[PDB]
Design a protein around this nucleic acid. Sequence first.
RNA 1: CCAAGUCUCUU
RNA 2: GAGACUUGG
Lengths: 49, 129, 49, 98, 126
Amino acid sequence: IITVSDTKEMENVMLYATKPTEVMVSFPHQEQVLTVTRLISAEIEKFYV
Amino acid sequence: VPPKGEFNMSTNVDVPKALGDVLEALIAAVYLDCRDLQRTWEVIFNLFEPELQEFTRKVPINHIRQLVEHKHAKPVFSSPIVEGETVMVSCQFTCMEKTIKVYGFGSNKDQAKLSAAKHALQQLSKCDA
Amino acid sequence: RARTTEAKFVLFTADKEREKTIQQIYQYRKAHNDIAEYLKDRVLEKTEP
Amino acid sequence: YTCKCIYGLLLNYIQSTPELRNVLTPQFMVGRNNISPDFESVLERKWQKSAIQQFRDGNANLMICSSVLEEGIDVQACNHVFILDPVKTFNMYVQSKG
Amino acid sequence: MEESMEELEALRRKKFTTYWELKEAGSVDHTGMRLCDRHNYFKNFYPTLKKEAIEAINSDEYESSKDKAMDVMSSLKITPKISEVESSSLVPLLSVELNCAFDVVLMAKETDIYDHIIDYFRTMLI
RNA sequence: CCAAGUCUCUU
RNA sequence: GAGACUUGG
């Protein structure tokens, strides 16, 4: 393998490639599920059997 | 009383196996000396009476199972994380409409998870009792 | 892929996996830096296996 | 531990003189019961390359060992050999000279 | 509502830091200085308290080495934990922990341990 | 009783 | 961990 190492080469390269600021959004997780999900379930298992 | 902090953390009070093994050894020795399973049962029950009485009115199922089967807990368990030789697991559970998170630690994944579930159960009981 | 200037990079993660995925991300940073150094500091006269 | 001690001393001196600053590259390695390589107490380090491979690769030019490299370990022909502690054994003398 | 990477990693390491501290009762790398320079902790310590402790250690108004020991401790705003250590010695072998952010722990026999810490601080304050 | 290194093998 | 081996003290 070969690659750029010189700082002049480094800064020449960042002209084209960028270090994007990267953040991390999270979300509250909930497990409560609605009845209709149970209904659709039951239907699909009936169909599977 | 445990101090106040930010993260509800817990670990496993390690139980040495030597204690249980030696108790079994004494039972075996008592039997062999007496050669009387009647006398052996007498001593065993004399030892076990409090726990036999207590367990009948409440059977302790596996702690993780207890937490899962609870009606109003609804536990959620994070993935394990390793830092050096400590393994971490965090439990997210709900009590009285307020969602409470507790953290457990252990030498490996299973122990950390069990400690987290145990701590959740302790907090849940403290809210129950 | 966020190659543009001042590009923004956003991660959607459930709360209960927040710590784990932070661990994984910083592991990735460590690995990347390790590749960079292993290529930079390394010197070889044969330059061919 | 004399290896690591004197290695640190050479590091200080190398970053103490102008004429030797950019010519000498001290590196030290010992046998089993491998003494810690760092002076930081951070449980893990980011540098991975090994000392013997460095010297073989020319990255390091100044080697601080203790009767480890004298036997077996292949190394490129070396310009100078300094036996800081007195010679004791004939066979070791022969091998260090070699 | 924006959620950056660095802070969450700081908290990630913070959690384990707290766990280590609790389980091992301190002794973690809590102090920020480099290990080789960490020794200078006690004089990077507040200069006002430093000169107060110099005056206290150079004082001779104390009836007992005990008196002077914990008077110096108070001047330094620290509360060492003193505990005994099992030993074969007829004289009880004592141990003291300074409880400060730098895990410094000593032992010495009851008679000299107070003199031992006195000398330790005659050295350390410098 | 002390060092060094080695080796099998423990963290 | 156990040690083992060589060399020397």
